[PDB]
Every structure is written in C-alpha cells, then in structure tokens.
C-alpha cells in the first residue's frame, strides 16, 4: 500500500548472482561482477560476466507474490549473561485486614 507506485520502486537493492551462498547471521555488503565464465572481462558488463545488482519493479498493480512485504526477524539468544529484556505486567489490587 505504501511502497508501490507506477514505474516501479527501485530504491531497494537486492542481488541474485553471487559467487557463493551466505551463512547464518552473516551480512554481505561487497558486490563483485558475476564472472560466471572462466574468461576474465576485467570487470566490464558483457559476456561471461553479468551485473550482480538488480531491483524489483514495484508498481501497485503487481500480484501478491510481487507485492513488497516487510518482514522482521526476532532473534533470541542466551550467552549466559545476566541481562534480561522482559518483565511481567501482572499486579492485582491490594486488599487489607
């Protein structure tokens, strides 16, 4: 609803051509030309080396699969530290006598 307009929203950056797959809890920022062939093209787009970067075209009339989605991953860990990130919200009204 708030991330689609005609012509396609190209601000988001994704790649689908990388030399190797990623690892769990790993972030990849560096990008290299996808030199699939053994013949080096010296980093110039053409044969045996394709552009790694790509962008989705987010026009509003796209289908649900093509509809952009915002996904949040909530990771939990216990490295044996006393830190705590929770807290109860239960408190009955007190009574006397």
């Amino acid at each position: 609803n708030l991330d689609s307009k005609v012509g396609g929203n190209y601000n988001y950056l994704y790649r689908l051509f990388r030399k190797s797959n990623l690892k769990p809890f790993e972030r990849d920022i560096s990008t290299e030309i996808y030199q699939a062939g053994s013949t080096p093209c010296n980093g110039v787009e053409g044969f045996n080396c394709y552009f790694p970067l790509q962008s989705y075209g987010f026009q509003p009339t796209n289908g649900v699969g093509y509809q952009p989605y915002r996904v949040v991953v909530l990771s939990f860990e216990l490295l044996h530290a006393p830190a705590t990130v929770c807290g109860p919200k239960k408190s009955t009204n007190l009574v006397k006598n």
Binding site: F17, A36, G37, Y50, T61, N62
Partner: protein
C-alpha cells in the same frame, strides 16, 4: 570453462529482463482513440521497439552459447526460443525491400475503394457491409460485387508477393526447411532429442483420412440448408443453381451464420428465451459472470485476479471513457491480469464470456514458468480449451444452475430450430476452406516449378469440393490466393488444422467424464464438480512437458481423431432425413456458373 553453465546463468538474468519490457508491450491495447491523444500510439510502439532492440542484443550473444550437445529438452526449449535465427539471416539490402511488400495491401486492400455508378452500393465495409445483407438482398451486389472487389486488389498484389515466395525461401533450403510453413511448425517438429524426436509425420496423410467421412454427410446437410432458401430468390437460388462464395453472407462467405435468418422453419411457433428476464428485474451480467465462475473452477480453473473486479463496467457511461470491442489475452504478467471487454447488455456477448473472461484463466495457470515458458503445449491447445463450454451457454440446462427463473421449468424436446444446425454451419462450412487453403501454400513457397499453373490449378478442386463456381474466371490481374486477409499479411494458417479438432477432443472428454455420450451438443456441463480432481495437473505442466503425454489423461490417444464430430450430427440427422427426401443430395458437377 564450458558454455553450458554460462548459458543457463544468463537465463536467470534473461527471464527478469524479458518480463520488464513485456509489461510495456501490453501496457495498453485500447488507449488509442477513447479520449484525446496527448500521446497514446507512440507510447507502446517505441516500447515494442525497445523490447525488440533489447531482444536482438539478447538473441545475438545467445548464439555463442552451446545450442548443440544438449541431449535433454527440459531446458533447451528455452534456449531454442531465444536462439532462433529469425530474420537475421537476411542482409541489410535484402531486409529493406521486405517491408516494401508488407505495406502494399495495408492501404488499398484494407479499405474498399471501388467506384460505383451513382453509389448505389459501394464495395467497402462502410456503411454496414455485413448488416445490409440481413435486410437487403439486392441483385446487383450478387454479380457486380464479384468483379469490382478484386479489380483494384490484384493489379499490384500479385507480382510484388512473388519476391517473398521465392527469394525469401533461399535460407529455408539452407536450413533444410521446406518453406516458411515448416518454419511455422518449428515448435511442433522437434529433432535430435532423446525420446522426443517428434516430427509432423502425419502431414503426409492427415489430409486424406479426415475428409473421407465428412463428404457423405456434408452433401446431405447442404440439401436441407438450401431447401429453406428456395423461397427467398428462386431466380438465382435454385436446386440447379449454385451459390458463389461471395453470396454466403460475406464478400468471401467463410462463416455461414448469416444464412440462419432466411431458413426459419416455423415462424408461427411461440419462442421462449434463454434468460426470460426482460422486465423490471434488470438482470446484471456481472452477477451471472460471478455465477458462472463456479462452473469454471468446477474443473479446477485458477481464479482470475481482482484486476477485473476492481476495474470493469456494466453499463457504458457514453463518455470518452470507453473500451473498444477488442478480444485479446492480457499477457501482462508480474501477477497482473485485468479483463476489460465490451460488457454491454447483449445476449451474444453473454455466451462468449466463456471465451472472453473464462478462457483467460489459462494465462496464470502456468504462471510458475518464466515468461518464455508461460504458454500452452502448442498453439491449438491454448485456443481449443476456451471453446469447450461456449456452445452450451444457450442451453436451458445452463439456466438451471443459474436459478434466476423457475428451477423446475420444463425442458422442451422441440429442438428442431435451425439454430441447432446454425452452430454446424460455421464449424463445418469453413472446414473445406481450411482443408485446401494450406495445401496451396505448402509447395507454392518452394517454387520448384514455374508459375504457369499457379492460377488454373488454384481454381480446380474448389469448383467441386465445396460446390462454389465463380461467375467470372479469375486471371493474373486477380490475386485470389493473395486476396485473403491472412495470406497477404503472412499469418500462419497451420493453426486451424489442430485448433478445430482439439476443441471437440477437449469437449468430448468433459462429456465423457460427465457420463453423457450421444448428444455431444447437449453436454450437461452444469454442476461439473466431478472433473476438477483430475485436470488440475494439466494446467501446471504448461510447456514443461510434451503435448503427447498430456493427451492421454482425456482421450488416451497420440494423434488427431474425428470421433466426436460423428455423434454430434446423429440426433439432427434423424430429423434431417425426412425433410430432404424431395431434393437430391449434392449439387451439379462442373455446371455453368453463368446460368
């Protein structure tokens, strides 16, 4: 490294690259004249140029990729589509003169400009060429129009098209292709493939067998059709007289639905209606369209998207906002599909919504495949699936599922109107035309022998096979084979051979699964909840599998067969025998067309 992995690697990028520009090509197919034109035509015309220009760079480097040494066709089918040689075999000088021929008939032939004395009846689409025949039967049109139409067409269209016929086929012989016709069947004929080395071997003998049993029944049918036509104009429509092709409701007379009006058997019989709601009920087509979807998904058809529902119309506003009556599949892709047709208040467009909006559901049925593979098994499969249920729209049995009228309404057995026969006129009337039109264009592109017999042999079998004798013999000044709407514009007519048969093969299978044999025309496709649990796998396979394997699930056959047509005419034939006993079967052979 081997190019085998590199070739697939570019295919990942190529799929995304194709999808972006294809959206632009199909962006607007009606935004031409509805309002004023700030810029409408040049918007997508340039986009197609950009897509074609981007396609040429994509195709050109795709040739370096190893097309050979590919023993399996699972993914080579995507390689071959892009790596087709296409028009690139020709030189720049050869390509320049090709477009000269294409625009020759684009102006003189598209509109009919032939002078008439006092302009009693001009030979043009305006004003109301087709409709004027259903009310007026003027004698002058019946003879004068035959000479005048082709007088201004064949002068220049005969010699110019010779260059494409002969000179443009030099590369076909280089690639062993017989003609452009063999190029049209590139997808049908696959060689050098493991276990799928399938060709069109039946093309040697498909022509003869299918028309063996048609002729004896075809001769009987025309006797009954012509019987009701005696009282119209006995001076020219006589049992001895023959009707030329221009006298069958069109300038070419290929479709014979115009012949129904003059052949009404009973004018005094009271008539009921399929809807029967022409009152203050104010029936809305969108409501029934919603009511028709359940039958469409009764055979597991994927639901067509919300684009049609979000943007459509019921009553035309009568303003600049209008949609022209263009029937076209919206291959937009990207998950986007919108159906915007002439949703007026007409009974005719009601019946065809099965081919208008219900046929569209095949587009996203194989949407899992890329854009190149988002298609049916072949051209005939795509077209024939949309015609399975169209013929039962006017059935009162279809109305029973609707529930608008009385559900307990009596089903009459007075099915003796020529409306039943009218459905056969279009199907079987044009069958002999498609039968011998393609045969003429098969060897003629080869040019093995001179053109001294191209005209006279063109007029040999058509005078007795279809019973049409031309009042005026045509000459080199008349390019009758090139006078068609498709031969002159290089349209592949080879689809008609497969699209016609497969529709009844698809239709008979549904009636077979609906325990309804005999009356094929009365197929009770309503409440067909018993067919969706098996045919759902065929939609997904798409082009990923040969059509031979898919055909087993409906008929279990490997070729083209004519069995459903036989039982189609049997209920009609029983009532047809008794009314044809006075008139002899067939027509005079090689009679004088003048009289």
């Amino acid at each position: 490294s081997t190019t085998e992995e590199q070739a697939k690697t570019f295919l990942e990028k190529f799929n995304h690259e194709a999808e972006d520009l294809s959206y632009q090509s199909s962006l607007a197919s009606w935004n031409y004249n509805t309002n004023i034109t700030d810029e409408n035509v040049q918007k997508m015309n340039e986009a197609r140029a950009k897509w074609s220009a981007f396609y040429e760079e994509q195709s050109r480097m795709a040739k370096t990729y190893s097309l050979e040494e590919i023993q399996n066709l699972t993914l080579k089918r995507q390689l071959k589509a892009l790596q087709q040689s296409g028009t690139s075999v020709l030189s720049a000088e050869k390509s320049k003169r090709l477009n000269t021929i294409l625009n020759t008939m684009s102006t003189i032939y598209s509109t009919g400009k032939v002078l008439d004395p006092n302009t009693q009846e001009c030979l043009a689409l305006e004003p109301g060429l087709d409709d004027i025949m259903e009310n007026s039967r003027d004698y002058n049109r019946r003879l004068w129009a035959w000479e005048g139409w082709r007088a201004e067409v064949g002068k220049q269209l005969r010699p110019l098209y010779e260059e494409y016929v002969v000179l443009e086929n030099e590369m076909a012989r280089a690639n062993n292709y017989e003609d452009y016709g063999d190029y049209w069947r590139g997808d049908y004929e696959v060689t050098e493939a493991g276990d799928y080395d399938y060709s069109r071997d039946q093309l040697m003998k498909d022509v003869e067998n299918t028309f063996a049993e048609i002729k004896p029944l075809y001769e009987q049918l025309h006797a009954y059709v012509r019987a009701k036509l005696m009282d119209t104009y006995p001076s020219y429509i006589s049992p001895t007289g023959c009707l030329p092709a221009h006298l069958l409701g069109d300038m070419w007379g290929r479709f014979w639905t115009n012949l129904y009006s003059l052949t009404v058997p009973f004018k005094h019989k009271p008539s009921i209606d399929v809807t029967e709601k022409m009152k203050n009920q104010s029936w809305d087509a969108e409501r029934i369209f919603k009511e028709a979807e359940k039958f469409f998904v009764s055979i597991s058809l994927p639901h067509m998207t919300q684009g049609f529902w979000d943007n459509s119309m019921l009553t035309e506003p009568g303003d600049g906002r209008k949609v022209v009556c263009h029937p076209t599949a919206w291959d937009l892709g990207k998950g986007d599909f919108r159906i915007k047709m002439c949703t007026k208040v007409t009974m005719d467009d009601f019946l065809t919504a099965h081919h208008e909006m219900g046929h569209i559901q095949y587009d996203m049925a194989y949407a899992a495949q890329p854009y190149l593979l988002r298609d049916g098994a072949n051209e005939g499969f795509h077209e024939a699936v949309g015609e399975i249920m169209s013929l039962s729209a006017a059935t009162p049995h279809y109305l029973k599922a609707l529930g608008l009228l009385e559900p307990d309404f009596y089903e009459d057995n007075e099915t003796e109107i020529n409306f039943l026969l009218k459905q056969a006129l279009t199907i079987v009337g044009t069958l002999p035309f498609t039968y011998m039109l393609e045969k003429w264009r098969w060897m003629v592109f080869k040019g093995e022998i001179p053109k001294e017999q191209w005209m006279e042999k063109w007029w040999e079998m058509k005078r007795e096979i279809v019973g049409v004798v031309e009042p005026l013999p045509h000459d080199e000044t008349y390019c009758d084979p090139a006078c068609l709407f498709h031969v002159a514009e290089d349209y592949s007519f080879i689809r008609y051979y497969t699209r016609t048969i497969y529709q009844f093969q698809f239709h008979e299978a549904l009636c077979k699964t609906a325990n309804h044999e005999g009356a094929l025309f009365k197929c009770d496709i309503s409440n067909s909840t018993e067919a969706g649990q098996r045919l759902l796998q065929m939609l997904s396979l798409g082009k990923s599998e040969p059509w031979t394997l898919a055909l087993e699930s409906i008929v279990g056959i490997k070729t083209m067969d004519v069995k459903p047509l036989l039982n189609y005419f049997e209920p009609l034939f029983t009532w047809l025998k008794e009314q044809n006993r006075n008139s002899f079967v067939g027509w005079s052979t090689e009679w004088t067309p003048y009289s």
